[PDB]
């Protein structure tokens, strides 16, 4: 109940000064606790996750940095007092701490980038979710657009499609559709390196692949490459997250695990074809990123005279010969 998650949120406050007293409220917790694994332990998971949601709900950047440290001495004040169990990730809602970490480094990666075009796509993205208090206080806000920033990505995309409907593409309008590509990209670079220090999200990425495909149809050479090294930087983070979820699930209920394979395999084919017009200098890195997707790098070696590449492919491979 609410009386409990307000008692550990009171023991973490003291868990910054001393421990002894907090270690006896975790000791009173283990004896007074339920201790039936299947849901009462996911009743204290629903508490540790309701306080990670409140250390994320918390000088707007130096104030969001102070909150990635707070949620860092909150993940250390859980490892010690322990806090060595519970997990209610299920569907849509331990991986939930990391995820709320990753999205607080995303909140600081778009705080570090503040210009008039993103701040406008953000104000359009927040006025659409609800109204804002007009007692000044107009960021128009962030502390709740952090716990949910995933949404200011699918909307700062709908504000690049209405800024592309007026783009009239015309050159300065294909420079504004790349500036956003570069931010959603290095906001996905910031969640990757925060995991190294350990269906709307995805749609908005397959939507900007196709809009990064319509533009290189009319673009000065060099520019059409930098947005191609970018949509290659981004596609290589999606294929890496479907690989990591595969490896997460295995065995029984396999039927669902061999149906999600066909789905990622019909997309590394839809990202390959897309790169069939593009430069094949990136194929070598796309073929290595989803380190097999051989059918694509095998038909790039066939379209050219690089019988040297299909010999360099089979030189470093596990059963490609029986595949080629």
């Amino acid at each position: 109940k609410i009386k409990l998650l307000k008692a550990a949120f009171l023991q973490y406050c003291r868990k910054d000064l001393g421990h002894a007293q907090m270690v006896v409220d975790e000791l009173f917790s283990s004896h007074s606790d339920l201790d039936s694994d299947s849901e009462l332990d996911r009743a204290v998971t629903q508490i540790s996750v309701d306080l990670m949601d409140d250390y994320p709900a918390s000088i707007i950047l130096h104030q969001l940095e102070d909150k990635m440290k707070a949620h860092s001495f909150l993940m250390d004040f859980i490892h010690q007092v322990g806090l060595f169990g519970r997990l209610g990730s299920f569907p849509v809602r331990l991986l939930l701490c990391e995820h709320a970490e990753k999205l607080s480094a995303a909140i600081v990666l778009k705080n570090h980038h503040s210009r008039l075009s993103d701040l406008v796509n953000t104000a359009i993205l927040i006025a659409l979710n609800k109204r804002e208090y007009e007692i000044p206080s107009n960021l128009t806000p962030a502390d709740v657009f952090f716990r949910e920033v995933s949404q200011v990505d699918t909307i700062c995309e709908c504000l690049l499609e209405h800024e592309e409907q007026v783009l009239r593409d015309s050159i300065e309008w294909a420079e504004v559709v790349i500036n956003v590509n570069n931010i959603l990209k290095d906001m996905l670079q910031a969640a990757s390196h925060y995991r190294q220090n350990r269906r709307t999200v995805i749609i908005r990425q397959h939507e900007i692949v196709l809009k990064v495909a319509y533009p290189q149809a009319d673009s000065n050479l060099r520019n059409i490459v930098t947005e191609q090294l970018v949509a290659l930087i981004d596609c290589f983070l999606d294929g890496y997250v479907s690989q990591l979820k595969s490896v997460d699930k295995s065995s029984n209920r396999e039927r669902y695990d061999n149906l999600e394979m066909e789905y990622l395999q019909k997309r590394s084919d839809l990202l390959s074809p897309l790169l069939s017009l593009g430069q094949y200098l990136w194929a070598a890195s796309l073929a290595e990123k989803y380190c097999d997707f051989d059918i694509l790098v095998q038909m790039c070696e066939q379209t050219d005279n690089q019988s040297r590449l299909q010999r360099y492919m089979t030189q470093f491979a596990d059963q490609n010969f029986s595949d080629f």
């Binding site: 050479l221 060099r222 430069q279 200098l281």
Partner: protein, 150 residues
Amino acid sequence: HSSNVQWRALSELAALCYLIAFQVPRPKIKLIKGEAGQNLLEMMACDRLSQSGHMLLNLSRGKQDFLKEIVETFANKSGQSALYDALFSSQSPKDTSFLGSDDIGNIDVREPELEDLTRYDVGAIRAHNGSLQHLTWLGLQWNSLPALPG
């Protein structure tokens, strides 16, 4: 010396190289300490644009807007690795090699104008000390063009 398949692919690769060179702007001549130094630097600039220029053309006369294809296909970073591959042995570290790290951005992919080419040649006559080799080459390069050299 090599076969036809390598020729086209290599000439394709070379066309990109000459293109990259031609695109490079005229160097900032005023920025040099002395008159001799700056005049030299400009002389070389004219030589670069002239030699690469005629080559770019002679390779583009082979087909219709052949240049456009070269950029659209090999301006991709994939070409940068295909260039390093054909030129060098891959064993060398690809990090400290300038070729592998250059930012090939917005290749003009615009064939050269004859009038510009003429003033490049004239300015680069002294590039190779006016060797009859130099001039006989230029004179031959203009032998296929509709405008004649000065």
